[PDB]
Structure 1
Amino acid sequence: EAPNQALLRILKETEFKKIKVLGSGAFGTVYKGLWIPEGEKVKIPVAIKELSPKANKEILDEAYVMASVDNPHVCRLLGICLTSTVQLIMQLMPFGCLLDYVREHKDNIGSQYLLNWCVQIAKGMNYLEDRRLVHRDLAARNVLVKTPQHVKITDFGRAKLVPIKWMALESILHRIYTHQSDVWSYGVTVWELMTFGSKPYDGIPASEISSILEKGERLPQPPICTIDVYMIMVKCWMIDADSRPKFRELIIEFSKMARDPQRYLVIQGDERMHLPSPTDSNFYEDMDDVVDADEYLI
């Protein structure tokens, strides 16, 4: 098939600085930082993922996929730094993951925001399908928040050309992954947003999930969801993968709904709710010459 002419940008250690730690796990640590390229007079806010020859291959596999994407609703690799550790330089998504965002801001999250997030995830996912890329790990923890109005899909660590409670039944039973198995995971992601961050099948052990799904049990109707929105989630969980919606149809369905949000999601106090916008005071050291990665192109 088609040659991948993506550019892998190698960045010098001296071109960027680590400010604080954003999160740390088994992989290594993610830092908040600033990238000050060559003699450009720009400060790009960045996220630095810092890490054995085996782990280096896995991070270089993530860098390969992350450098091959370019969409407004997908996180791209800005570059890699080849130190003794090997670090991925990415765009700072200052509001963190969508999962914690819906949990921390439930009292200010209205129907408009929820349906628009669904449209953006469907757009990002449809783009990955265009690029013949199966995510294999779509979940609300892997959707990042640039601004409350703009979200992006990330975490290409499993992406190809195990998270049980987000997986399609074919994936649990036969290790089959398709763009239609990503649709199942999209359904679970939506359920997570609609329940303001609830854990899917809470208390149920992962080994019981396969049997539960086979019997015909599914995640319940969130209280804010009209039958219109739940019906969509339910279609994403059909046994027959081809019977599930396509991401391009999910874009259309959620867009029609986002034009009249209160007809599809019932939230007390909706419309009187407000989240930070770039049109707010103190929304955005030296704030001189800072440009977002989305505006820094070469």
Structure 2
Amino acid sequence: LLRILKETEFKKIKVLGSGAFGTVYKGLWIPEGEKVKIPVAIKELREATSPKANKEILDEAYVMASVDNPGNPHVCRLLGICLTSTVQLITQLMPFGCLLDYVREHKDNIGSQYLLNWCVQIAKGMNYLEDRRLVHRDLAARNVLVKTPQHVKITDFGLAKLLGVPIKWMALESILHRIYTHQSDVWSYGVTVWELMTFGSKPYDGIPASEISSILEKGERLPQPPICTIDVYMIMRKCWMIDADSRPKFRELIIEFSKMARDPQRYLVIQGD
């Protein structure tokens, strides 16, 4: 289900990366009663962020550990949690980091099938969260992880729900009132697709966070990337509608993006293809 990692169960090695939230460390975790060495990534979360007590956090982590059964190949599994002064999250180690970095470092080699199938997998896993009523809140190309170039997963789901900010990914009702629903993640999915279609480009590049709220009221959304056909941009702009119910569901996106993958040369225009 989810182990409670004692400080002496896991080891730390290189810092895979460090952000505002805290740090992510590559390392070796050995379970309570086993001789197996496990390659893990330890998300060190910064102290004094959650008003909730460590017990209130732990029980809530066990509720979010239910999503790991039956599970989905495009949703991550929390291998275990450690609760000292900070919250350290332990999962299996993705060697190929996140999709945002991947689509940046391999921009020229990335094809139309690779791109459209990534949208497919992400929608499949995002739908799986909607099946368990877990609202992600923070869906971005940096939160999509790569296990293999042909297999992606979603991480950091409900971590805001666990402890309580990307304004460019958030929908208007989240920017203004912080109301997160499964339909809000469709807007964030829309931003995520645009990110893949722009090989890691910053959403609303340069435009200050304070402007974004009032800038979206003026009707302006993300600009259409040159690789997307009009049929793909209708899906991205569908997700960016004002009404939450006007945006599509993750079930609809699974069918549409797989239908689109049944002739990618008709939906994505690039070199090599």
Short-chain TM bin: 0.7 to 0.9
Whole-angstrom distance in 2 between the partners of 1:200 and 1:133: 25
Is the deviation greater in 157-166 or in 228-237?
A: 157-166
Give the aligned partner of residue 75 of structure 1. 76
Whole-angstrom distance in 2 between the partners of 1:45 and 1:15: 12
Give the aligned partner of residue 237 of structure 1. 240
Residue 61 of structure 1 contacts residue 157 of structure 1 at CA under 8 Å; is this kept in 2?
A: no
Aligned residues: 263
Q: Secondary structure at the match of 1:20?
A: strand
Pick from 160, 165, 170 the counterpart of residue 167 of structure 1: 170
Q: Secondary structure at the match of 1:213?
A: helix
Residue 187 of structure 1 contacts residue 237 of structure 1 at CA under 8 Å; is this kept in 2?
A: yes
| 1:154-178, Cα deviation, whole Å (9 max, x unpaired) | 1136444992111111222333221
Residue 23 of structure 1 contacts residue 29 of structure 1 at CA under 8 Å; is this kept in 2?
A: yes
Whole-angstrom distance in 2 between the partners of 1:27 and 1:180: 25
Is the deviation greater in 52-61 or in 177-186?
A: 52-61
Whole-angstrom distance in 1 between the partners of 2:18 and 2:63: 22
Q: Please tell me the root mean square deviation across aligned C-alpha atoms, in Å.
A: 2.6
Distance of aligned partners of 1:198 and 1:173 in 2 relative to their CA distance in 1, 3 Å threshold:
same
Unaligned runs of 5+ in 2: none
| 1:2-31, Cα deviation, whole Å (9 max, x unpaired) | xxxxx4412344443323221123433221
Distance of aligned partners of 1:50 and 1:62 in 2 relative to their CA distance in 1, 3 Å threshold:
farther
Distance of aligned partners of 1:105 and 1:231 in 2 relative to their CA distance in 1, 3 Å threshold:
same
Distance of aligned partners of 1:256 and 1:221 in 2 relative to their CA distance in 1, 3 Å threshold:
same
Is the deviation greater in 181-190 or in 36-45?
A: 36-45
Distance of aligned partners of 1:159 and 1:124 in 2 relative to their CA distance in 1, 3 Å threshold:
farther
Residue 61 of structure 2 contacts residue 162 of structure 2 at CA under 8 Å; is this kept in 1?
A: no
Whole-angstrom distance in 1 between the partners of 2:205 and 2:219: 17
After TM superposition, give the deviation of residue 131 of structure 1 in Å: 0.9
Distance of aligned partners of 1:58 and 1:217 in 2 relative to their CA distance in 1, 3 Å threshold:
farther
Q: Secondary structure at the match of 2:245?
A: helix
Whole-angstrom distance in 2 between the partners of 1:59 and 1:108: 42
Residue 102 of structure 1 contacts residue 109 of structure 1 at CA under 8 Å; is this kept in 2?
A: yes
After TM superposition, give the deviation of residue 217 of structure 1 in Å: 1.0
Whole-angstrom distance in 2 between the partners of 1:201 and 1:79: 36
After TM superposition, give the deviation of residue 104 of structure 1 in Å: 0.8
Whole-angstrom distance in 1 between the partners of 2:266 and 2:182: 30
Runs of 4+ in 1 over 6 A off after TM superposition: 52-55
When Rg is computed on C-alpha atoms for both structures, the one with the higher figure is 1
Whole-angstrom distance in 2 between the partners of 1:108 and 1:40: 42
Q: Secondary structure at the match of 1:140?
A: coil
Alignment of 1:37-76 (within 5 A): 37=31, 40-51=34-45, 60=58, 63-64=61-62, 66-70=64-68, 71-76=72-77
Unaligned runs of 5+ in 1: 1-6, 270-298
Whole-angstrom distance in 2 between the partners of 1:158 and 1:104: 27
After TM superposition, give the deviation of residue 204 of structure 1 in Å: 1.0
Q: Identity of paired residues, percent?
A: 98
* TM-score of the superposed pair, with normalisation by structure 1: 0.79
Q: Are 1:216 and 2:219 matched, yes or no?
A: yes
Residue 133 of structure 1 contacts residue 159 of structure 1 at CA under 8 Å; is this kept in 2?
A: no
After TM superposition, give the deviation of residue 95 of structure 1 in Å: 0.7
Residue 134 of structure 2 contacts residue 157 of structure 2 at CA under 8 Å; is this kept in 1?
A: no
Is the deviation greater in 40-49 or in 225-234?
A: 40-49
Whole-angstrom distance in 1 between the partners of 2:56 and 2:91: 17
Q: Are 1:31 and 2:29 matched, yes or no?
A: no
